[PDB]
Design a protein around this nucleic acid. Sequence first.
RNA 1: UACUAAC
Length: 127
Amino acid sequence: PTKFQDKYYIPVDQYPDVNFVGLLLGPRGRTLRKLQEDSNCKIAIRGRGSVKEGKNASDLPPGAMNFEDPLHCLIMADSEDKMQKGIKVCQNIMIKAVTSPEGQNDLKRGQLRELAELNGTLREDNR
RNA sequence: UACUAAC
Ligand SMILES: [Cl-]
């Protein structure tokens, strides 16, 4: 969008051992691309901790190597309404990560299942 | 709940 942009800060200090980035991206980044279609926004994960140590920097989009800010979703839209819907769907995911009772995060279960399909390691047993 | 890495 580029006309309207906002940063949604991820509560890393409060939850230092929750993997928010993985829950947002999903297998192959597919969850984040769905969130973008949901909100009609471009969404990027940026800031300190948004890049695995240490990725092929020369293969990264502009601005991705700026770690001055804490971890955030950068939301970009071409109306204020869309931008706010983008903040909403990111906040939804953050809330899901923190308030899901152990083992009841359906989004994450589905993600890990789909990941296993892609890696050919799917199992459907109780062990 | 197979631990995700998009642009
Ligand atoms: Cl079996």
